[PDB]
């Protein structure tokens, strides 16, 4: 899209209507006449544009009005409200911009942010920019969280997020103009190679892929049009629905052969019955010829009855000689029909074990996308965020994705090696109790008006608790935590001195020998300038290979690679790294997924802040003190970096509105 209307789309907003959020800040406009709305709407859209086409500098409210054109630059406060709203919720002036208006000498309110993952860093940066005192507590010795970039010498390989999902409507686009990310497109090509190491014939690669895609669309049809979402009182998973569809597709293959061979028997017996008539007729014609000959043998001159007998038998025999011929037309006609059916026999199988093996690799990709075995995904809701996917090619960050969190950390008060252990929130405020990770006896008390928790859903899930809440989170929040799915997904980084793969290919496959091992090193990535290949471990394999040493794992890599490229071309790797995210105490997994029995509605539960009870009884109801960001709190963009970032922007808005006041509602 183009112009002001493109700015609305590039900010994930409908250009021609007002969103529920801005209805809530501008109940006058959306409640008023259409004219004003289009004013507001245009007034918003231009402002977004101004921010967007230069997001390396603050878009100040003065520079906004200054460049509006009448009549849109006449309601001086509607502009000031619009700009204020946009600045509050980080639709403008977010990320890393050179500030025109310098920060305020003295601050307002204290926020402790748990975790300096992207969602943490994004809020901190916004909250600081609103004049609040912000400190981040971070268990690791580095920022970024699940954005984790390996760096030894000139090797640069990313153990965490690798790909930006397309700049159409993506905030990371903005970040990439403010930071030097070297973004490189991912060519959608992906050559398979099966367990032996020989490519999959383009006949197959195409038809199995096509079957996978239809098996998916099939499950979607069982879900929405047949309402197959409950089986023996339990939620149906994607995995089950896939097995159901595959079985019904095998069942049909069988039913198809049954009705076909039952067409050969229906006519083989129609033949048998015909030949019975034929054979019986031939016998009758055996007798009549003898009878005619005997009557014919009486030599003339004969009396007329003996003449009738020859004449009679003769016609009687040419009649029976007529039926036996009208029957042999019929024998010929069924003989071709029988031959015909033998010649167009239906499909012998649905999918051979050869095939089902290659289909298993399409499933490992799906299990990678969801960081979990398909038996856990909600059939109904697993893809519930498809509608919000951005437009464009997927990209990788060629200099490492760390550059982004590290950039965002500039100017922030981060306490590294500081493991929050207890969060205490009360009507009067909060204390956060952390220890030092190097030596746990060292203890820290942090006191603040509000806590922003970006603890990963796996951390929040941990039993016994890595982090204690005082008081306990309400059961509506803890239930959402149990219901949701925090998956697992691991990478092997292989660094060689010589590029020996197809350097025009970003990603190529390896078909897993078994259904169980379908996730075990099934997919390789050539994303980097240095000779680095990167191998996935997904699905049921992810949790398994965690309990297996790196040397065994880099072995199974070299084996799979050698079989596909030849033992001469594979050197030994110069540096190796094997992620283990389920074991990582500050992750306890990779990212969220919509578990069976969950829904995207849990992602909203996650994001909904906690308000403590009153200290004094009968005191007025208090302010919310505990807020939540992180990729598991944004239902429309889960399990992604732009999801994290957006959620952090969202909270810094909700928090600042609560503690600094939203003055743009009048």
């Amino acid at each position: 899209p183009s112009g002001v209307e493109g700015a609305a789309f590039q900010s994930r907003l409908p250009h021609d209507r007002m969103t529920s959020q801005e209805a809530a800040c501008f109940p006058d406009i959306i409640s008023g006449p259409q004219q004003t709305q289009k004013v507001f709407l245009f007034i918003r859209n231009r402002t977004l544009q101004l921010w967007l086409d230069n997001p390396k500098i603050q878009l100040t409210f003065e520079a906004t009005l200054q460049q509006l054109e009448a009549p849109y630059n006449s309601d001086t406060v509607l502009v000031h409200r619009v700009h204020s709203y946009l600045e509050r919720h980080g639709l403008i002036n977010f990320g890393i911009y050179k500030r025109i208006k310098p920060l305020p000498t003295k601050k307002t309110g204290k926020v402790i942010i748990i975790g300096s993952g992207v969602s943490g860093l994004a809020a901190a940066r916004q909250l600081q920019s609103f004049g609040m005192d912000v400190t981040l507590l971070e268990a690791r010795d580095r920022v970024g969280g699940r954005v984790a970039t390996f760096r030894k010498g000139n090797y640069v390989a990313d153990l965490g997020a690798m790909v930006v999902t397309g700049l159409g409507g993506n905030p990371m686009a903005v970040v990439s103009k403010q930071v030097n990310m070297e973004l490189a497109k991912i060519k959608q090509k992906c050559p398979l190679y099966e367990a032996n190491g020989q490519a999959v014939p383009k006949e197959k690669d195409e038809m199995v892929e096509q079957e996978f895609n239809r098996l998916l669309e099939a499950t979607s049809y069982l879900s929405h049009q047949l309402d197959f979402n409950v089986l023996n009182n339990k939620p149906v998973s994607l995995g089950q629905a896939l097995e159901v569809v595959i079985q019904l597709q095998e069942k049909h293959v069988k039913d198809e052969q049954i009705e076909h061979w039952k067409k050969i028997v229906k006519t083989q017996e129609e033949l048998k019955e015909l030949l019975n008539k034929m054979v019986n007729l031939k016998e009758k014609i055996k007798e009549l010829h003898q009878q005619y000959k005997e009557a014919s043998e009486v030599k003339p001159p004969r009396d007329i009855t003996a003449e009738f007998l020859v004449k009679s038998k003769h016609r009687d025999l040419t009649a029976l000689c007529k039926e036996y011929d009208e029957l042999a037309e019929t024998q010929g006609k069924l003989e071709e029909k029988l031959q015909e059916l033998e010649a167009n026999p239906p499909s012998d199988v649905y999918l051979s074990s050869r095939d089902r093996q290659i289909l298993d690799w399409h499933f490992a990709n799906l299990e990678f996308a969801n960081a979990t075995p398909l038996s856990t995904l909600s059939l109904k809701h697993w893809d519930q965020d498809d509608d919000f996917e951005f437009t464009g090619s997927h990209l990788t960050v060629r200099n490492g994705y760390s550059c982004v969190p590290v950039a965002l950390a500039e100017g922030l008060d981060i306490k590294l090696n500081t493991a929050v252990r207890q969060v205490r929130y009360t009507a009067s405020g909060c204390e956060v109790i952390a220890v030092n990770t190097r030596s746990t006896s060292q203890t820290f008390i942090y006191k603040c008006d509000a806590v922003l928790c970006t603890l990963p859903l796996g951390v929040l899930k941990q039993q016994p608790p890595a982090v204690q809440f005082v008081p306990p989170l309400p059961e509506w929040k803890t239930s959402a935590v149990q219901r949701m799915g925090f998956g697992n997904l691991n990478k092997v980084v292989l660094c060689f001195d010589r590029v020996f793969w197809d350097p025009s290919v970003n990603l190529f496959g390896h078909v897993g020998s078994t259904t169980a091992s379908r996730g075990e090193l099934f997919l390789f990535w050539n994303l980097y300038k240095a000779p680095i290949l990167l191998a996935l471990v997904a699905g049921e394999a992810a949790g398994i290979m965690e309990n297996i040493s790196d040397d065994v794992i880099v072995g199974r890599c070299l084996a799979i690679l050698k079989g596909i490229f030849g033992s001469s071309a594979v050197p030994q790797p110069k540096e190796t790294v094997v992620s283990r995210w389920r074991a990582d105490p500050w992750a306890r997994g990779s990212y969220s997924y919509v578990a069976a029995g969950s829904s995207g509605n849990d992602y909203d539960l996650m994001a909904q802040p906690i308000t403590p009870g009153p200290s004094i009884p009968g005191a007025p109801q208090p302010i919310p003190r505990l807020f939540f960001a992180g990729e598991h709190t944004i239902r429309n963009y889960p399990a992604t970096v732009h999801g994290a970032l957006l959620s952090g922007l969202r909270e810094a808005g909700r928090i600042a509105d609560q503690f600094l006041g939203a003055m743009y509602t009048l």
Binding site: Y221, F228, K251, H252, K254, H289, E307, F308
Partner: protein, 133 residues
């Protein structure tokens, strides 16, 4: 609104597979064991049909008789009047067959004949006899 093409997903079918844990494997095996039932029965009927063909070797070709190409005639010789009365007794009212016994008379005046000599040849009486059989 409808499944993708090639995919077969009936409402009925799913319950059958869904109803028990091993239901799919049995239902498939039923079909699997019912297919051998059908292929084993083709082999049976194919072998039975092969024999029945073994018997019809020769066709009916030793037993065919040369076609009698004969110009039709309208005059009833006393001979072929007598062929007729006999033909009527052995056939009744199959006016065609009665014509090819005679072979000089066409089909129609066999029809004619019936009324013409109806009393002189007692055709009614003759036709009663044919109805005993």
């Amino acid at each position: 609104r409808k499944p993708p093409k090639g995919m077969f997903l009936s409402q009925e079918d799913v319950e059958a597979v869904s109803a028990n844990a091993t239901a799919a494997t049995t239902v498939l095996r039923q079909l699997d064991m019912e297919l051998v039932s059908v292929k084993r029965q083709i082999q049976n009927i194919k072998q039975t049909n092969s024999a029945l063909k073994e018997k019809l070797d020769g066709g009916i070709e030793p037993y065919r008789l040369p076609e009698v190409i004969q110009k039709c005639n309208a005059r009833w010789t006393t001979e072929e009047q007598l062929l007729a009365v006999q033909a009527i007794r052995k056939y009744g009212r199959d006016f065609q067959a009665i014509s090819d016994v005679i072979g000089n008379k066409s089909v129609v005046q066999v029809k004619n004949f019936f009324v013409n000599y109806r009393r002189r040849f007692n055709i009614d009486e003759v036709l009663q006899e044919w109805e005993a059989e």
